[PDB]
Amino acid sequence: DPGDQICIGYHANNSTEQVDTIMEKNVTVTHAQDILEKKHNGKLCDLDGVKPLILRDCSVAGWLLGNPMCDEFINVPEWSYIVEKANPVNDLCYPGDFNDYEELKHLLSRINHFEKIQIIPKSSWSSHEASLGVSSACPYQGKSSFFRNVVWLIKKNSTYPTIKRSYNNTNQEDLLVLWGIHHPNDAAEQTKLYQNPTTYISVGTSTLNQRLVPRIATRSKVNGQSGRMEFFWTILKPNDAINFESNGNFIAPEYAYKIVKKGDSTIMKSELEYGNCNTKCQTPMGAINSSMPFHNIHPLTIGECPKYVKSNRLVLATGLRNSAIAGFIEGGWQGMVDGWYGYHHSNEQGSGYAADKESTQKAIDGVTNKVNSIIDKMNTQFEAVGREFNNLERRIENLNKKMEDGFLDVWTYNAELLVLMENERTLDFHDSNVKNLYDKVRLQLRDNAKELGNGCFEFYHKCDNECMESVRNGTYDYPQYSEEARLKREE
Amino acid sequence: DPGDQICIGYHANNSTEQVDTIMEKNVTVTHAQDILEKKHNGKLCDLDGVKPLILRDCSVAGWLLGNPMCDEFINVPEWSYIVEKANPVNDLCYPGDFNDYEELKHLLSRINHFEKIQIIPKSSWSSHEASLGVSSACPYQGKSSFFRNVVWLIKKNSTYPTIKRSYNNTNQEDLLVLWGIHHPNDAAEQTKLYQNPTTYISVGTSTLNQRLVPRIATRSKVNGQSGRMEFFWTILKPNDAINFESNGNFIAPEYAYKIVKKGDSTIMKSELEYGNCNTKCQTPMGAINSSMPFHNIHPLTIGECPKYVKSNRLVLATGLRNSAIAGFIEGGWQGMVDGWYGYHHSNEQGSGYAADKESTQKAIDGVTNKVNSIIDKMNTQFEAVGREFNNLERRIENLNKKMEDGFLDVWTYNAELLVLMENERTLDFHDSNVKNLYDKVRLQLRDNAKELGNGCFEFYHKCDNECMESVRNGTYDYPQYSEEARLKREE
Amino acid sequence: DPGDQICIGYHANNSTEQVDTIMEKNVTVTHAQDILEKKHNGKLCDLDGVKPLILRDCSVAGWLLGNPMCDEFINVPEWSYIVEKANPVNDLCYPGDFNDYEELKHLLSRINHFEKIQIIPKSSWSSHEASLGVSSACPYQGKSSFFRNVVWLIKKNSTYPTIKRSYNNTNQEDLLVLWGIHHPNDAAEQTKLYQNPTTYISVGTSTLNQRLVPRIATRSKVNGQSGRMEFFWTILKPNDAINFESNGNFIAPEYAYKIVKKGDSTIMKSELEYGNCNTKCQTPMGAINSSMPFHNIHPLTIGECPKYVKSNRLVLATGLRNSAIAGFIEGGWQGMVDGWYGYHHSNEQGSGYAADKESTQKAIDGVTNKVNSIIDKMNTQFEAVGREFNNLERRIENLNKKMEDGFLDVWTYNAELLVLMENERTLDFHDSNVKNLYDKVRLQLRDNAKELGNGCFEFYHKCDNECMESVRNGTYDYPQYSEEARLKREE
Ligand SMILES: *[C@@H]1O[C@H](CO)[C@@H](O)[C@H](O)[C@H]1NC(C)=O
Ligand SMILES: *[C@@H]1O[C@H](CO)[C@@H](O)[C@H](O)[C@H]1NC(C)=O
Ligand SMILES: *[C@@H]1O[C@H](CO)[C@@H](O)[C@H](O)[C@H]1NC(C)=O
Ligand SMILES: *[C@@H]1O[C@H](CO)[C@@H](O)[C@H](O)[C@H]1NC(C)=O
Ligand SMILES: *[C@@H]1O[C@H](CO)[C@@H](O)[C@H](O)[C@H]1NC(C)=O
Ligand SMILES: *[C@@H]1O[C@H](CO)[C@@H](O)[C@H](O)[C@H]1NC(C)=O
Ligand SMILES: *[C@@H]1O[C@H](CO)[C@@H](O)[C@H](O)[C@H]1NC(C)=O
Ligand SMILES: *[C@@H]1O[C@H](CO)[C@@H](O)[C@H](O)[C@H]1NC(C)=O
Ligand SMILES: *[C@@H]1O[C@H](CO)[C@@H](O)[C@H](O)[C@H]1NC(C)=O
Ligand SMILES: *[C@@H]1O[C@H](CO)[C@@H](O)[C@H](O)[C@H]1NC(C)=O
Ligand SMILES: *[C@@H]1O[C@H](CO)[C@@H](O)[C@H](O)[C@H]1NC(C)=O
Ligand SMILES: *[C@@H]1O[C@H](CO)[C@@H](O)[C@H](O)[C@H]1NC(C)=O
User: Fold this and answer.
1) Does A89 contact B at CB distance below 8 Å?
2) Of A60, A100, A229, C437, which has fewest CB within 10 angstroms of its CB?
3) Could you tell me if B286 and B251 lie in one domain?
């Protein structure tokens, strides 16, 4: 009247943080953690402390050849990836074509060193016209102009002598060389420009064995030209020579480019400001500090990235299902201000709540380890995802799309079920921990106390604060009170 | 002599439905659900309410150029995918080659609008022979003939004047234009047919800059021709002009094709009847109503499909392990005609079975949610899987095969283990639910009853139907009978 | 004073074998099993009982054409894959190019039958010079030489008559035919060698329609040649003829190759000895007997292989957490010399340990089934992983790398978490089994014994070895001792 009591119970709090499990939707819970990165900084950033190459209104081709309307950032000796607009305004001012363009974009996507040099001075053309090679398709300061890196040679007097030019690459570094051929409209234009009616450009390195011949066709005007310029490139290894021979129609190099290539990346289509941030993962919509193993921002990423996932929320339960003084069977304790599982006693020294420190540590550690494993086991490689295929490579683009879409489906399904399965396992761990604590006590006390049915025991003897601590420590000397218990029990 | 009794037990039934778990093979179970679609309708069907294009004995090339033996469905203004036989009977009647054929098949795989028009009337050839261009390789009504969409121009009198033809595309829609070059056997045939010994075809759009030249070689007869016809195509954007100029050997357009292209699909190899069904997933062996997240019919699918899996059966447990009156420890109850877990009482008002409605709902809901999650979380995108690569693209075909085979291995393993893991979890949930119900009762009754060891309690007091309901409701007033219990207990 | 006793306990042993679980790192455990193959034999081996093709210092091209410095294993009628060194010493002695080389390597990667034959005897050149076609780029026995499979025809007297040669393929098997064109330095060399200033090679099968024309350019010396040899191949189906016609610059066939092609494989880069072993999985670093479902040796494998994984250890728990006479609550029993779970009794016939045979079998079977499922459910297809793309196919190489790196990330993550999740499930199974055994006994004995709190019961009656066996059998007749128990209990 009335006997000393110890109850087993668990933490509860004012949290409304919800969670899904394989078996129940929308379960309220004590603490939760999202494993899905949703947040970008909305800017293009260095990658591993190397600037991008931003081409505001130029294309790579425009940029390389010197489209004279390309008002771009000129000096920039190294980059990690390239940013083009979707359809750049300024491409090939004079209509034509860039042979193996997509392969050259991919090669220029990440460069360790890039330095333009002069290989063939515009001044060394003694027996041809350097400065007439000019068009109203390629306007500069209101006047007609041309690509600035490459010389459109015309006949001088009424003569176009055969050209012979070797350049030997005496630099330490691979040289990227560009040249072109002019495809004129008719045999009139051919002779008007080059005198010789039948022409060729021949180019040879140790690798290259090229003989180009102009093609006449009747073609629709583009930038008011029916002519076409067709451009070619090669990489001149650092002790080789390139050898040009031409009768006519030659768009000769002035400027080449020293390159040092140390692994690839890609070209990103984006409308964003550089931001002076560093990052290890860049997106068309912005960069990411990628601690989380999943993101849902954009598929077309460059760097060490979280796996892209079609998903709004990946939330793991970390805490508990959230809902004398009665114990566990009836609900959680707001009063358990600290600890996850534990006790409420009441004796002659008075009542209160105590944490089971030992079984609360085991569980915080377990849940923490569960969360870190799901995060830390994620293998994170460098990748560069772009669209590097032209309108005659659609079969290969469709191969790429099945692969991307394939991996998106695997990660999205697996992450979704991983969260649902481990949430069901986390809430059952908490149940299993509370019930093991009931049984820890039940098995110490045996007949020295009676199970009240609600999570509590009423003692058959006096249990002061020091006896209570021995129950919580698992050091309860049952023989020391079996005598006193037996007397109150029999009655 | 003898006391009132309540037992805890679970449903059992005549089911032989088996299931595998990570730990036990072939476990009999109360109800099961297959998550593996195995059933097709054996027919080719519309896709998203758009007909396929069935080419019974033609190839796409045959079909486009007008191989005159191609007896096909002529009118058909739009399609979602194409069906060819494996090796069609009718291809190129006159032997030769179709430039960039596989890219053109992929472009024509799904078309929003397709309308043949005449761009160059067969009648407009005033200074050349339209109607002699004919061969016994391309037989029609027993007589020698040719491709019907394209004109094989021969010299008139003994003259082949230079051809100049612009067509301007004044339609609203992109035009697909086809032309050809004849590669003859020798300089005799060349002049016999075209007079001029040295010829060219030149074709120019705003895009295209082509000059074809016939090639002589000594070639093996095919359909009794040693000649070769080589065909070319382009897409004429809706305000551009195409410009032909030819000396000879020109296979000119008569008919072109208006196309509107809204995303791609592929070409399916199949021997099946159209069936007037609609579907969202088509297979070479038949269509699928794809509610299930996995199928095992065929890899080469077009649509939103279940993931293809190498597997006979993916069966999830939904029910229970299947095997006074004794309770749970001894087996299941055929008498539990309704509900999964519950009770059998016997008192002075008589005996019977009662469901634990509350804990049976929780579990049906849980299992239902488990099954729906495993199904609903499956991300389902449109994909079109074909073999779009020729016998010089084998490296790219092998890239495609590693990717397909790679995803088949991931899904097949993951689905197999997902079923085994969640089956072990489902059967342990049912164990855990029954035992929690034993403990619900055990904890209400305490010493007012004795555990019989077999799943049952014998009461130490009179428990009529209304007391029993309070045990099942969890509203058992123990103080109301501790007195009467204590008297029968002490004795 | 003192009463008969039965305790429930579990196996323990001197094991230090550790294991990780989703929730605890470094858990000591009774027995463990690695599922990660780490061990290769360090040798190149037959694949499915078919030898590889080892090219010690040759390239495939060198090998095919007969680079006379290629001292290789000559006779070898069939192979399963090819081994080249990274950069072979001996390639094209005379500098040039092999058209569609990578596609030909992939076609020759696995051959069912390969037999060189003579199609055009070196002796049949009556009106040209067979034996002058020779260079100091292609040295043999100190003297100048050439490719041995192919004849460099020079003019005889000062004449190079037009060549006409059909070969008809009267063998049962596809023929691989090789020829070349010489691209000379200038019109002097052209006429010095071939007399005719303007030349062509024309080649025609039922498939092929080729006209090659030599290209002059000024080119850097390679092996002291500025000339270039460019080689071409085709497959002559078994009743077709190939037809050569040449004016000059013709590198004619002597030897062709009978091939029978039955599915593909790839070219492996490795520095290893053949070893006369058979295997079903080959690695650049050595072969594997692939019973395990995961390996971490090398990505570039050929055969039925374990999935490649970035991982040091995949270790599954199979045994138990490893740590009167007290039962389970206090730790494991070294004395439980045999069985996983069971009993220690002590009565008047004396004390000892007994296995619960029934519940130990269930569990060994369960764990064995868990391990076999994780291994046996692994779908294992043939694949051949190589690097089959040249320095202008980098976009397709980058597609391949994302796919490989993609699958490495999926398998590595999934295997890691599968081990951690199933380890946590295995240790909780063992807990759940021991506690069910405590409850098996507790529920048989009821009040005929008292729970000592530590895993033990003290009996309220005499329990000889035969009573004890009935407790372990689950056949304990409680009515047979309730009388004797009640007397000792009341007191
Ligand atoms: C879960 O919660 C949200 C409210 O935040 C609600 O839209 C949804 O309907 C709830 N229930 C289920 C079963 O999804
Ligand atoms: C071109 O150069 C000069 C005149 O400025 C003259 O000597 C030369 O012969 C001219 N050639 C012709 C063919 O008109
Ligand atoms: C085609 O016709 C239209 C309208 O008559 C004209 O504006 C257009 O420029 C023509 N296209 C070409 C390139 O001639
Ligand atoms: C547990 O509690 C008792 C009572 O306060 C105390 O004497 C003892 O130090 C504790 N035992 C252990 C092992 O912590
Ligand atoms: C499972 O059941 C089938 C009979 O339907 C049988 O073939 C098989 O051998 C059984 N047992 C095992 C271990 O697979
Ligand atoms: C071809 O056309 C007519 C005869 O039908 C004649 O006027 C013309 O000159 C003929 N040409 C030749 C070169 O025979
Ligand atoms: C090759 O020889 C066979 C048998 O003599 C002959 O039937 C076949 O047509 C020949 N092939 C060609 C295309 O000449
Ligand atoms: C449970 O059972 C008792 C006895 O029939 C009944 O009076 C009461 O309405 C029920 N209580 C609840 C909360 O359903
Ligand atoms: C696990 O064990 C190894 C010693 O073999 C040690 O390096 C490591 O630090 C241990 N602990 C953890 C938390 O990884
Ligand atoms: C080459 O062959 C013989 C001399 O050996 C001679 O009959 C023939 O005319 C020679 N030709 C020329 C053009 O010198
Ligand atoms: C380029 O110049 C270097 C050094 O003067 C020389 O050794 C080298 O051979 C030259 N290259 C060629 C192919 O001429
Ligand atoms: C179990 O043990 C008892 C006592 O030894 C023995 O009589 C009986 O044969 C056993 N019962 C069964 C079903 O094995």
Assistant:
1) no
2) A100
3) no
